[PDB]
C-alpha cells in the first residue's frame, strides 16, 4: 500500500457511514461526486471511515473512535458513566488495527465535528483521563488503556475540514435549544425501536427497545433517562461554550502534524451582515443567516453552519497561515490552509447534489491533495 | 463450537438479511420472536445467514450461495450469461469458509425458495454444469469449480422449511404474470439508483445506476435489458413448471441427510375449497385463496403461499414420512416431517408480528429441534 | 326526498380524520372498506353526513366546531375560554350543511368514541349556554356566539354513542395523557402545521400553523411558547377518568332527546381475574387493552381495546335503562343501553380494521341499518 | 363586490395537483410559499379560482373537465370519444363555480404549462363543438353535452398562457412519451387508484379506481386490460410536437378574445452552440433542459427547463404580435407575445421552487399584478 500509516476519516455530527446508513441516503465521504474510500483504495491507499455516534458527545465519540481502530468493546469510563448517568459499556468493534500501539501510527482526517473528536481522543492517548485514573485508584477494577495516558507515537497527523474548533452560533441559538434537542432525542428513541437496523448513537442512554417490550413501556422507560437534561450530547459540544471546554482541555502534541481547512459560503450584505450564497446547501440556509447576523462582525462569514473564525483553528492554540503549495509538514502547530471560496460545509464531502458548481474532479483533487500532504508527513521523519 | 459443521441458513424469495435490510424492516431469521443467528450463537453453535439475491433465479441464487460460503467473485458461467443475456461476474464475497473443500462440510437450512437454492447448488458441486463444461472445452478460458462436478463430502444435510419443491399457483396466477413482474423489476430499477444502499439482487441485469448517469438515461439503458422477458428470474422458478424443471435436473445424494417441514394455515369451506385461517399473515390472504380454490383438491391446503402438496417433497424423488420424535438420520431420502398445524409460510421465520398465537418460546424450540437433528447427523457417520 | 326527516350527522372520535382532510393513503373512518356508511346510506335514500372536527382538541373545542360544521360560519370558541386557556378565539369557517338550523329543524347525532362526548357537550351549549361566556359578555360587552347563550331547543332529536368513553379510559390516564405522550402528539401537530402541509390535525388555534415566510427554526420557537404544552384543554386530558367526569358533572338529561349507547367487549378473563385482549383485537390496542384489563378494580377491566365496558355503557350517574336489541328504543330522556356486543373491539364499530377478516361487511351493514331504523322510529313516534 | 367583472380561472398544467387533491405534504401549485395567488388576489378584492382537472389526462379530457369545473355537473367526455379511445363516458361531478355560466357571463382563463393548451381546447368546444360527437348524436340519438354542440360565444374574455408548450416539447418526445416512462406514469396512477387513496391523479376514467372489495391482485388484472397503456389519449402524447400540432391544427382565433403569452428562458449557449441549464434551474429539469438544448435544429434549443422558447411564444402558424411589457395588451384575435423573461425557468412562473432563493416573492407578486392589471384593461376596453 502506498501510505505507510492507515488513514482514518472521521465523520461529524449526524453522520452515518457504511451499512449504518438508511436504505436511500447520501454517501457521507464524497456523495456521488468522489467516492473517497472507494477511489483512494483504487489508487493504492489504505483508508477507512470510522463509524462513531452521530448524536453523542465528543467524549463519547472519542472513546468509540479509539475502539473502531483498536478493536474491542467500548468502555466510556466508570467515572464518566456515573457522572452523566449512562451505560459504561457500548458497542463492540472488530477494529481496523488490532495491534495499534506506540510505534504503529494513523493519520486522522475529520470533517466538521470529527475534527473535535480526533483532538479529544489523541488527548486521552497522550495525557489520559484524570477522573478515570482517580476512580480506578479509589475503587480498583479495570481502566481502559485509552484513559491511562503516556501513549505517544500513535497519531501521525490530525487534519480538520470545516471543523467548529470554536463552536457555532447555529448550536447556541438552534441545535442546543430545548425544543430542538427534544426532536433529536425523539428521533433517537424512534430509531431505537425493535425493527430498526440503524444506530443513531445514543443507545448507551437507553434508546434501544427490547424485543418483547411494548413501545408504550419503551416510551415510559426512556423518558427517565438523563439524556433529556444532559450536556453529554453533541448539540452541547458544538455550542461556543461546549467547544471552549474542549479547547481548554486539549494541547498540542509536538510530534503530530496539524492542518485545518475552511470554506466560506456567505456574501456581505449592504449593512455588513452575511447571507448564504446561492448554492449554499438549502438545509443550512437559515443557520447561515443566524451566524451571518451575529452582533460581532468577525463571527459572521460562514460555510452554512460554521463561522470562519471557528473553522480556522482553536482560539487558544498556536497557528500559522500557510499557502496552498507551501509544504504543510510543520509539527506542533495548526497550519491554517487558505479559505476555499464558494465551498459550504458539505461541499467538503460532496453531498450537496444540488450544487452543480461543485463537481467530482474538483473533489478528487482536494482529497488527492490531502493524501499527498499526508505522504509528505510520512517521508519527513 | 458445539456443531462440527457450520450451519448456513438460506433465505427465500424477497429475503433481505444483515446490513442489506432497509432501515426499518423485520429481521428475516426469527423476527422479534427468536433471533436465530444471535441465540444459536449464544448457545455455542456456529451458524450463518447467507445473503443471496432476493429476486434472482434459483440458478443465480445457487451460484451466489456457493461464493457466500467459499468466498470469491461470483461467476454465473459464460454459457449461462450468454444464453440469458446478463453479466457473467457479480458480487465479491469474503466467504465464511475460505478452505471449504471435500472433507469440510456444511449443514444447509433453507426457508421457502432457499430450499430450492440449496438443492441446485449441491447438484452443481456433485454433477457440475454440462453447458459450462462444453463451453470451457470449446472456447477455453476459466471455469468456476462450482461447475466442474465431482466434488462430494461437502454438504452434510439439506433441510427445507415450507419450500415449494413443486411450485405454487401463487406464482403461476400472480407473481409470474406480466404486470406483476414489471412491478418487481421497476422496484429493482429504483433500488438500483445511485443513492440506494440495499441490493435487491438483479444488478447483473444492469439495474445499477452509474454515479454520473441521469435517471432518465438509466431508465433508457435498463429498458433494453433482457430481464423484462427472461425466465432467469425467481418468479418463473416458483411456478409449477419452473419448479418441475429443477426437480427434473436434481437427484438424491446418497450421503446427504434430507428433511422437509411443512405448515398448513388453511381451513376447509363447505364446498371443499380452502380459505386462509385468521392469523394467516394478512399479506398472503389473497394468494392463500388462489391456491385454496384450485380445481385439483390435493393442491388446495396451503400455508398462505405454498400448497402442502408442494412443500412435503419433490414429486419425483423418493420420500418417507417421519414422526416428530423419530430420528431423522436416514440418508439419500426426503424425510417428510409431520405438517405443523396452524403455521403459515412466515411463522417458520417468526416475522408475523400480528399473530399472537405464535410466540417466541415455540420458535426457539423449533430451531433447537433442527439443530439437535443436525447434531445427530454429525454423530452418525 | 330523503327517507329520514332529520339529517343524521356522524361524529368521529379522537385522532379521526375524514373526507378531504385525511392523508393521501389512509383508511376511511366511517366504515373502512367494509361498509361505506355515508356512500351506502345515501344510496339507500337517507340524508347522512360526516362531521369534520378537531382530531386532538378538547371536547369543548370539538363541540363548538361541530356546531359550526352543522350551522355554518366562523368558529367562535368564546372570548372567556380563549383568554382562560390561551388559544385563539376564532378558528376555521365552515360551509355548514344546515345553514337554516334552528329550533324546529332537528338532527340525529351519532358519535363514535370521543364523538359521543362531543355530541353531548354541544347539546348542553344549545340548551344551557356556557356560563363563563355569558358572564364575560355581561361584564365586557362585545358579541357572544348564539351557541353560548342557551335557550335553543328542539334542535337535536337523538344522541347515539358507539364505544364512547363516557367515564374515561385508563388508556388515557396511564398512557395517552402522560407527559411523554402529550409531547409526541403536540410534536406531530407542530409538524403537520408546517407550511407545506394540507391536513389539519385540529390544534392550529394553539399556534400550530407555520406562516409562508417563517423558517421552521422560528416556527419551533414561536409555538414552544404556546400554552398547549401544559394545558388541560385537549383530548388527551378529556379522555381520562377525571376529564370525562367533569363533562358528566356539567351535562344533564334533555327530556325530548332519545339516548342510545352501544358497547363492545374484546377481552377475556385471564387466569388471575385480569382481562387480556382477544385474538383479533386490532393490534394497536394490544397494549392499551392489557393496561385496562389489569386495573385494580375488577369492574373496570372488561374492555374493547381502549375503552372499558363500564365507561361505554352510560355516563356514571346519569339515568339509564338496559334494553334488548330488538325492543323499541324510543324512550326519551334516558340512556338506553344496548346489549354488549361480544367480539367487537373499539374499531370494529367503524370497519377500519382491514386485518381482521372475521368481521365482514354484511354484519357492519346490518349494524348501521339497525341504527337508522331506530332513528326512523324516533321520528315516527313524536 | 369584486374588482374584476369576470372571474379569473387559473388552470394548472401536467402533473399539477390543487387544493384538497394534493398529498399531505406537497407544494402549493399557484404561488408556492412565495406569493399565494388565490389567497393574496382574493385579499386584494379580485374574484379568482383554481381549476382542478386531470393531472395526467389528455388535453381533450382536461378541457371537458375544465368546463364542468366552471359550469357544474357530471363530466361527459362524449359517447363518440369514449367509444374511440376506450374509456368511460362519464367522470366526476363538479359543484361548479359559475352555475350560471352562459353567453354574456365571461371568464378570464390563465393557464400555466399544459393549462395553456387545455384552455384553448375548451374554447374551441364552446364556439365550434366537437364534430365527432355531433355526428354520433345525429346517427344514434341520445343526449349530447352542450359543450359539444358549438355556438356558445361571449363566454371567454381572455386567454393567457405562461410557459405553455403550444408547439410541444422534446422533453415529451424523447422521454415523457417513451414506452418506459408511460408505464411508470400509468403504474403510479394504478397505485393511487387503490382503495385507500384519497388523491385523484386524473386517469380513473381508464379504470384506475380499485373497488372496495376487490383484491389488488384482481385490480392489477382488470386494469391491465385497459386501453390506456397503448392509447394516445393522454398528456404525455399531447405534449409531444405532433400532439401539440394536432391541437394547433384544430383550433382557430376567436376575434373577441384577448390572447397573451409569457415565456421564460433558463438556458445559456454552451461552447458548441448547444444550450445548457442555468445555475438555479430547478434540478428536476436539469436533464430535460439538456435534452432540449442539444436539439439538432438551433431554433429549438433555448428553453426554460422543459419547454423550448420557440414553443412557448405562440402556436406555430397562428397570428401573433410581439409586445413590450408596458404597452397596452388589449388587442383581440391575436397572440400578444410578452418579452421573454430572462432567468425564469418553467416553475419560477408558479413559485414552487423553494430551493432557488434568488427568485423572491415580491417579484412573483408583481408578475401576477401585471396579469390582473392587463385583464382589468381587457374589461375596461370592450
Ligand atoms: Ca454548495
Ligand atoms: Ca401466522
Ligand atoms: Ca377487530
Ligand atoms: Ca428557478
Ligand atoms: Zn458519555
Ligand atoms: Zn442468471
Ligand atoms: Zn379550547
Ligand atoms: Zn379521453
Residue ranges of domains in chain A, CATH in brackets: 7-167+239-267+308-379 (3.40.50.1820)
| Integer Cα distance of A38 and A364 in angstroms | 12
Decide: D369 and D102 in contact? Cβ < 8 Å: no
Question: DSSP secondary-structure letter at B321?
Answer: E
CA distance B233 to chain D (A): 20
| Integer Cα distance of C300 and C310 in angstroms | 6
- Which residues does chain D have within 8 Å of residue A279's beta carbon, measured at their own beta carbons? 279
Q: For residue A198, what are the CA distances in angstroms to A62, B41, B159, D44?
A: 20, 22, 32, 51
CB pairs under 8 A between B and D: 36
| Integer Cα distance of B39 and C114 in angstroms | 45
Burial C42-64 (b: 16+ CB within 10 A, else e): eeeebbbbbbbbbbbbbbbbbbb
**Alpha carbons within 13 A on the beta-carbon side of C278:** 20
Q: Which residue is it, cell 396579469? A: D371
Of all ligands present, the nearest one to the C-alpha of B64 is: 6
CA distance B338 to chain A (A): 30
Decide: A2 and A43 in contact? Cβ < 8 Å: yes
> Can you name the residues that pair with B196 across neighbouring β-strands?
A24
| Integer Cα distance of D17 and B97 in angstroms | 56
Contacts of B23 (CB under 8 A, 6+ apart): A22, A23, A191, A196, A197, A198
CB contact under 8 A, C183 and A182: yes
CA A359 to chain centre: 24
DSSP letters, C231-295, are: -S-BHHHHTSHHHHHHHHTT----TTSEEEEE-EE-EEE-TTS-EEEPTTS-GGGHHHHHHHHT-
Q: Is D355 helix (H, G, I), strand (E, B) or coil?
A: coil
Decide: B279 and B344 in contact? Cβ < 8 Å: yes
Burial C257-280 (b: 16+ CB within 10 A, else e): bbbbbbbbbbbeeeeeeebbbbeb
CA distance A284 to chain D (A): 11
Decide: D245 and A316 in contact? Cβ < 8 Å: no
How far away, in angstroms, is B357 Cα from ligand 2 center? Answer: 8
Chains with ≥3 CB–CB distances under 8 Å to C: A, B, D
| Integer Cα distance of D382 and D380 in angstroms | 6
How far away, in angstroms, is C82 Cα from ligand 7 center? Answer: 6
The closest CB to that of D355, out of A354, A356, A357, belongs to A354
The question of whether D12 is a catalytic residue gets the answer no
Q: Is C336 helix (H, G, I), strand (E, B) or coil?
A: strand
Contacts of B94 (CB under 8 A, 6+ apart): B71
CB contact under 8 A, D280 and A278: yes
The resolution in Å comes to 2.6
Question: DSSP secondary-structure letter at A173?
Answer: I
The closest CB to that of C36, out of D36, D192, D212, belongs to D212
Q: Which residues neighbour ligand 3 (ion) by CB within 5 Å?
A: C 345, 348, 353, 356
Q: Which residues neighbour ligand 5 (ion) by CB within 5 Å?
A: A 60, 232
Q: Is D57 helix (H, G, I), strand (E, B) or coil?
A: strand
- Which residues does chain C have within 8 Å of residue A286's beta carbon, measured at their own beta carbons? 215-217
Decide: B100 and B106 in contact? Cβ < 8 Å: yes
| Integer Cα distance of B51 and C136 in angstroms | 71
In the PDB record, what is the listed experimental method?
X-ray
- Which of D302, D286, D295 is closest to D347 using CA atoms? D286
CA distance A278 to chain D (A): 7
CA-nearest residue to C360 within chain D is: D213
Decide: B65 and B12 in contact? Cβ < 8 Å: no
- Residues 325-344 of chain C with CB under 8 A from chain B are none
Which listed residue (D58, D113, D145, D226) is catalytic? D113
Q: Is B245 helix (H, G, I), strand (E, B) or coil?
A: helix
CA distance D9 to chain B (A): 34
| Integer Cα distance of D305 and D309 in angstroms | 10
In degrees rounded to 5, what are phi and psi of residue C124?
Answer: -60, -40
> Can you name the residues that pair with B75 across neighbouring β-strands?
B89
The question of whether B151 is a catalytic residue gets the answer no
> B300 is written with which cell numbers?
388446495
- Which residues does chain B have within 8 Å of residue C355's beta carbon, measured at their own beta carbons? 282, 354
How far away, in angstroms, is C97 Cα from ligand 7 center? Answer: 23
Decide: C108 and C6 in contact? Cβ < 8 Å: yes
| Integer Cα distance of B203 and B52 in angstroms | 12
Chain B within 8 Å of C279 (Cβ-Cβ)? yes
Q: Is A195 helix (H, G, I), strand (E, B) or coil?
A: coil
| Integer Cα distance of B226 and B216 in angstroms | 19
In degrees rounded to 5, what are phi and psi of residue C276?
Answer: -120, 155
| Integer Cα distance of A294 and C124 in angstroms | 55
Question: DSSP secondary-structure letter at D111?
Answer: E
CB contact under 8 A, B216 and D287: yes
- Residues 15-44 of chain A with CB under 8 A from chain B are 18-26, 32-33, 35
The angle at the Cα of A188, spanning A185 to A193, to the nearest 5 degrees, equals: 135
| Integer Cα distance of B52 and B65 in angstroms | 6
Burial A28-55 (b: 16+ CB within 10 A, else e): bbbbbbbbbbebbeeeebbbbbbbbbbb
Burial of C325 (0-12, 13-18, 19+ CB in 10 A): exposed
| Helical packing angle, C114-128 and C59-71, nearest 10° | 70
- Residues 168-227 of chain C with CB under 8 A from chain D are 192, 194-199, 212-213
> C234 is written with which cell numbers?
385537549
The angle at the Cα of B284, spanning B283 to B290, to the nearest 5 degrees, equals: 140
Contacts of B84 (CB under 8 A, 6+ apart): B226, B230, B231, B232
* Region of residue C103 (phi > 0: left; psi between -120 and 50: alpha; otherwise: beta): beta
Interface test with B, best of A29, A197, A212 (most B CBs within 10 A): A197
CA distance A214 to chain C (A): 7
Which listed residue (B51, B53, B112, B310) is catalytic? B112
- Which of C14, C23, C3, C36 is closest to C198 using CA atoms? C23
* Share of chain C residues as helix, strand and coil, in percent rounded to the nearest 5: 35, 15, 50
Decide: D149 and D96 in contact? Cβ < 8 Å: no
CB contact under 8 A, D212 and C33: yes
DSSP letters, B166-218, are: T--HHIIIIITSHHHHHHHHHHHHHHTSTTB----S-GGGT----TT--HHHH
How far away, in angstroms, is A347 Cα from ligand 1 center? Answer: 5
The closest CB to that of B356, out of C279, C356, C357, belongs to C279
Which listed residue (B11, B107, B136, B345) is catalytic? B345
Q: For residue D194, what are the CA distances in angstroms to C22, C61, D321, D327?
A: 15, 34, 48, 51
For A130, the enclosing helix (H) or strand (E) is: helix A130-139
> Can you name the residues that pair with C258 across neighbouring β-strands?
C158
> A212 is written with which cell numbers?
418483547
The closest CB to that of B357, out of C279, C283, C354, belongs to C279
Q: For residue A116, what are the CA distances in angstroms to A131, A245, B43, C278, C308?
A: 20, 11, 42, 55, 55
| Integer Cα distance of A21 and A11 in angstroms | 13
Contacts of C117 (CB under 8 A, 6+ apart): C59, C111, C164, C165, C166, C238, C244, C247
- Which residues is chain A interrupted after (C–N above 2.5 Å)? none
Contacts of A285 (CB under 8 A, 6+ apart): A276, A304, D357
- Which residues does chain D have within 8 Å of residue C194's beta carbon, measured at their own beta carbons? 25
- Which residues does chain A have within 8 Å of residue D279's beta carbon, measured at their own beta carbons? 278-279, 356-357
CB contact under 8 A, A179 and C221: yes
The closest CB to that of D279, out of A276, A353, A356, belongs to A356
Contacts of A270 (CB under 8 A, 6+ apart): none
Which listed residue (C113, C145, C158, C311) is catalytic? C113
Decide: D315 and D297 in contact? Cβ < 8 Å: no
- Which residues does chain D have within 8 Å of residue B215's beta carbon, measured at their own beta carbons? 287
| Integer Cα distance of B76 and B91 in angstroms | 10
- Which residues does chain A have within 8 Å of residue D354's beta carbon, measured at their own beta carbons? 282
- Which residues does chain A have within 8 Å of residue D358's beta carbon, measured at their own beta carbons? 278
| Integer Cα distance of D73 and C26 in angstroms | 28
Q: For residue A324, what are the CA distances in angstroms to A109, A358, A364?
A: 18, 19, 16
The closest CB to that of D283, out of A276, A278, A354, belongs to A354
How far away, in angstroms, is C373 Cα from ligand 4 center? Answer: 60
> Can you name the residues that pair with C267 across neighbouring β-strands?
C277
CA-nearest residue to D355 within chain A is: A282
Catalytic (active-site) positions of A: 112, 345
CB contact under 8 A, D279 and A276: no
For B241, the enclosing helix (H) or strand (E) is: helix B240-248
The closest CB to that of B23, out of A32, A198, A211, belongs to A198
Decide: C287 and B287 in contact? Cβ < 8 Å: no
CB contact under 8 A, D25 and C212: no
CA-nearest residue to A358 within chain D is: D279
Amino acid at each position: 500500500p502506498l501510505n505507510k500509516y492507515p488513514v482514518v476519516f472521521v465523520h461529524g455530527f449526524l453522520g452515518l457511514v457504511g451499512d449504518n446508513a438508511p436504505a436511500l441516503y447520501p454517501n457521507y465521504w464524497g456523495g456521488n461526486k468522489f467516492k473517497v474510500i472507494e477511489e483512494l483504495r483504487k489508487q493504492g491507499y489504505n483508508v477507512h471511515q470510522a463509524s462513531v455516534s452521530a448524536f453523542g458527545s465528543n467524549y463519547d465519540r472519542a472513546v468509540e473512535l479509539y475502539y473502531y481502530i483498536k478493536g474491542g468493546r467500548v468502555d466510556y469510563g466508570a467515572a464518566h458513566a456515573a457522572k452523566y448517568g449512562h451505560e459504561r459499556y457500548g458497542k463492540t468493534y472488530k477494529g481496523i488495527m488490532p495491534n495499534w500501539e506506540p510505534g504503529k501510527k494513523v493519520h486522522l482526517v475529520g470533517h466538521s465535528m470529527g475534527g473535535q473528536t480526533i483532538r479529544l481522543m489523541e488527548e486521552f492517548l497522550r495525557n489520559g483521563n484524570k477522573e478515570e485514573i482517580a476512580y480506578h485508584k479509589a475503587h480498583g477494577g479495570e481502566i481502559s488503556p485509552l484513559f491511562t495516558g503516556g501513549h505517544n507515537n500513535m497519531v501521525a497527523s490530525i487534519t480538520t475540514l470545516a471543523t467548529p474548533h470554536n463552536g457555532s452560533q447555529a448550536a447556541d441559538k438552534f441545535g442546543n435549544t430545548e425544543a430542538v434537542r427534544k426532536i433529536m432525542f425523539a428521533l433517537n428513541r424512534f430509531m431505537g425501536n425493535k425493527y430498526s437496523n440503524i444506530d443513531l448513537g445514543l443507545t448507551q442512554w437507553g434508546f434501544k427497545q427490547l424485543p418483547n417490550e411494548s413501545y408504550i413501556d419503551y416510551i415510559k422507560r426512556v423518558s427517565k433517562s438523563k439524556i433529556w437534561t444532559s450536556d453529554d450530547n453533541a448539540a452541547y459540544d458544538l455550542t461556543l461554550d461546549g467547544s471552549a471546554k474542549l479547547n481548554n482541555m486539549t494541547s498540542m502534541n509536538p510530534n503530530i502534524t496539524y492542518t485545518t481547512y475552511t470554506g466560506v459560503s456567505s456574501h456581505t450584505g449592504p449593512l455588513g451582515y452575511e447571507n448564504p450564497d446561492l448554492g449554499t446547501f438549502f438545509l443550512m440556509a437559515t443557520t447561515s443567516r443566524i451566524i451571518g447576523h451575529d452582533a460581532r462582525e468577525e463571527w459572521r462569514k460562514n460555510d452554512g453552519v460554521v463561522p470562519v473564525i471557528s473553522s480556522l483553528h482553536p482560539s487558544n492554540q498556536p497557528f500559522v497561515n500557510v499557502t496552498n503549495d507551501e509544504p504543510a509538514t510543520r509539527r506542533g502547530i495548526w497550519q491554517v490552509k487558505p479559505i476555499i471560496q464558494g465551498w459550504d460545509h458539505v461541499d467538503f464531502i460532496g453531498v450537496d447534489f444540488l450544487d452543480f458548481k461543485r463537481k467530482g474532479a474538483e473533489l478528487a483533487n482536494f482529497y488527492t491533495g490531502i493524501i499527498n500532504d499526508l505522504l509528505r508527513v510520512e517521508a519527513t521523519e
